[PDB]
Amino acid sequence: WKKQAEDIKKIFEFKETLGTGAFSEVVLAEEKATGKLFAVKCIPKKALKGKESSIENEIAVLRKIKHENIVALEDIYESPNHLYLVMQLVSGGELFDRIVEKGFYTEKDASTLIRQVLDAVYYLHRMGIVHRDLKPENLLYYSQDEESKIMISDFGGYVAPEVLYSKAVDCWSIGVIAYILLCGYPPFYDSKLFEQILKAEYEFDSPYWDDISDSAKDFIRNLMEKDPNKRYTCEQAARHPWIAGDTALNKNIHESVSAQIRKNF
Amino acid sequence: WKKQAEDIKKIFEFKETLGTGAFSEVVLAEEKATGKLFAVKCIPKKALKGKESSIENEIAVLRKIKHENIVALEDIYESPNHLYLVMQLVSGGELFDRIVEKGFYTEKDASTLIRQVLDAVYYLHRMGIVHRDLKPENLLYYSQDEESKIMISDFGGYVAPEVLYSKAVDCWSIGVIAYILLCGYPPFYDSKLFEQILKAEYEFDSPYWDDISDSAKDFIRNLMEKDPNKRYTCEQAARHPWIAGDTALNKNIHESVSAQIRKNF
Ligand SMILES: Nc1nn2nccc2c2ccccc12
Ligand SMILES: Nc1nn2nccc2c2ccccc12
Numbered sequence: 001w002k003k004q005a006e007d008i009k010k011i012f013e014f015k016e017t018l019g020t021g022a023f024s025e026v027v028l029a030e031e032k033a034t035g036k037l038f039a040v041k042c043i044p045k046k047a048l049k050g051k052e053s054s055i056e057n058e059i060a061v062l063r064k065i066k067h068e069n070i071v072a073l074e075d076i077y078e079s080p081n082h083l084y085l086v087m088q089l090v091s092g093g094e095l096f097d098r099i100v101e102k103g104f105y106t107e108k109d110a111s112t113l114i115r116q117v118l119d120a121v122y123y124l125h126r127m128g129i130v131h132r133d134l135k136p137e138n139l140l141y142y143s144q145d146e147e148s149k150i151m152i153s154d155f156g157g158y159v160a161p162e163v164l165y166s167k168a169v170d171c172w173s174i175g176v177i178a179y180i181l182l183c184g185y186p187p188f189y190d191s192k193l194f195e196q197i198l199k200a201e202y203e204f205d206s207p208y209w210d211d212i213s214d215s216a217k218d219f220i221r222n223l224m225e226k227d228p229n230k231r232y233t234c235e236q237a238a239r240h241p242w243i244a245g246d247t248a249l250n251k252n253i254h255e256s257v258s259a260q261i262r263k264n265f
Numbered sequence: 266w267k268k269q270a271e272d273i274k275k276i277f278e279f280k281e282t283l284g285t286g287a288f289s290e291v292v293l294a295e296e297k298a299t300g301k302l303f304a305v306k307c308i309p310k311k312a313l314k315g316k317e318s319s320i321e322n323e324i325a326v327l328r329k330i331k332h333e334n335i336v337a338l339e340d341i342y343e344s345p346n347h348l349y350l351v352m353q354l355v356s357g358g359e360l361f362d363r364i365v366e367k368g369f370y371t372e373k374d375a376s377t378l379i380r381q382v383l384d385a386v387y388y389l390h391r392m393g394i395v396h397r398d399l400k401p402e403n404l405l406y407y408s409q410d411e412e413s414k415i416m417i418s419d420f421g422g423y424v425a426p427e428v429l430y431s432k433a434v435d436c437w438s439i440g441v442i443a444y445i446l447l448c449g450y451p452p453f454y455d456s457k458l459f460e461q462i463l464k465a466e467y468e469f470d471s472p473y474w475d476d477i478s479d480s481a482k483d484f485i486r487n488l489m490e491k492d493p494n495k496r497y498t499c500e501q502a503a504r505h506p507w508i509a510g511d512t513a514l515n516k517n518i519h520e521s522v523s524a525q526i527r528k529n530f
């Protein structure tokens with residue numbers, strides 16, 4: 001299930017660097033035998049010392065499973081001292097860029113995005129994976145298509161008060177993302193910030209929140225809940241009317257949200 | 266995520282019946298708009314009364330996930346009184362037919378089959394699904410290819426002593442399947458049979474088991490373990506040398522296994 005290589009460069013022509021992380025890089029790569037483009041995560045083995053097997057079990061299991069809202073692992077290569085995760089390259093661009101570029105953007109659009117993230121994270125949780133790093137940077141659109149889905153592209157403010165813990169920390173992160181999706185700025189924002197987060201002290205301030213539904217605000221409260229016990233799970237969040245029902249509004253909130261994204265990020 | 270239809274027959278031409286179950290049928294079907302063949306499971310809604318949502322949640326989640334060793338759910342249609350699960354049609358045929366037809370069959374072949382079933386069932390367990398009905402009839406080859414994988418094709422001797430319970434019942438079933446794969450006959454076989462199962466009384470009888478490895482027998486013992494606590498999980502079984510290592514033998518055991526399948530089934 002792992003392909004072996006004496007030298008990865010016999011298989012891929014590496015191109016531009018797409019991302020860099022703690023102790024890995026993600027690079028764009030052409031498969032020399034086929035032309036096909038991929039995103040390849042490059043990981044030195046010595047960085048995984050100890051929990052090498054455990055992290056090669058997340059990978060061994062995930063290799064066999066394709067989730068609609070997570071970039072698929074097409075292949076794993078092993079050399080003497082590295083693992084290479086060969087991933088489906090997406091073509092739809094970054095989350096905020098997309099929202100800024102839209103002419104029209106509603107709560108229904110935000111709800112659809114969150115629904116997809118909930119589905120992906122529910123799956124990861126079921127598999128015993130706590131993502132711990134859900135944030136906009138790690139969400140990419142699949143394609144340029146108007147109807148493109150969003151996908152978790154990568155694994156390693158958004159951190160749960162208990163951290164500052166269990167799978168519930170991810171659900172907090174999703175709540176923060178939802179907050180940003182509906183107003184264009186983060187719910188917290190240096191010691192007073194740290195203080196705010198640890199007391200889950202945030203507001204739906206005017207004028208930015210005035211045109212947002214009660215249902216959306218309730219949804220966010222239930223995820224951005226200090227008590228990780230009372231906090232909605234992904235399963236609970238997915239049943240909420242804002243996600244599963246028809247309470248998400250159809251008002252164009254693009255002007256304000258985009259203004260705030262531009263100004264705030 | 267569910268397509269709605271006033272009449273399913275506007276979408277599919279139904280052909281031969283592929284399977285029948287408790288209160289559903291699986292039928293071969295041509296998509297009229299495209300020609301493409303599928304396997305369609307047809308389910309009256311009233312059969313799911315009560316746990317309708319719950320069973321529509323197994324489906325709602327699974328729709329988004331493709332496992333290499335489970336037939337994929339391509340689409341779900343809903344009419345006023347039925348659900349239709351539209352599945353990827355396989356082309357590789359039934360498990361025993363394939364083994365009888367081979368000229369050469371080894372423990373390594375059996376191990377590869379079990380590895381795949383372990384992977385599928387591990388995933389189902391992680392999702393909170395207990396299959397409860399794992400048996401050869403529910404395993405089909407993907408293609409005619411020599412290297413074809415096996416796939417769970419369907420959901421609803423092989424039943425765990427505790428039943429005669431938890432996800433562990435599936436692991437018992439896999440042990441029974443492994444037993445049959447290595448000798449061509451069931452480990453139990455009417456009141457004395459019921460008695461045997463409830464005491465996990467079985468043997469690796471000569472001459473059929475003489476050419477089988479100790480490693481294979483140990484593997485089977487660990488799954489066909491009366492105590493569901495001590496019983497190997499799918500995760501444990503997948504780490505066993507017979508599956509993960511190189512203890513599976515390379516001896517052609519086809520003559521005997523096929524003889525016994527033919528005679529016994
Ligand atoms: N530009 C990127 N594209 N794709 N495509 C698949 C996976 C990724 C990815 C992962 C991490 C960082 C950047 C990217
Ligand atoms: N970009 C990814 N990075 N890492 N890092 C470890 C495991 C994974 C992974 C698995 C599936 C899809 C994407 C990725």
Ligand SMILES: Nc1nn2nccc2c2ccccc12
Nearest residue numbers: 283284291304353354355418
């Ligand atoms: N002959 C069959 N073929 N395929 N292909 C996909 C799923 C199934 C299936 C399920 C149940 C019963 C028979 C079959």
Ligand SMILES: Nc1nn2nccc2c2ccccc12
Nearest residue numbers: 306336337338418419420421
């Ligand atoms: N043949 C199947 N039958 N049923 N019945 C309920 C759920 C499913 C299912 C899901 C995925 C793949 C195959 C099937």
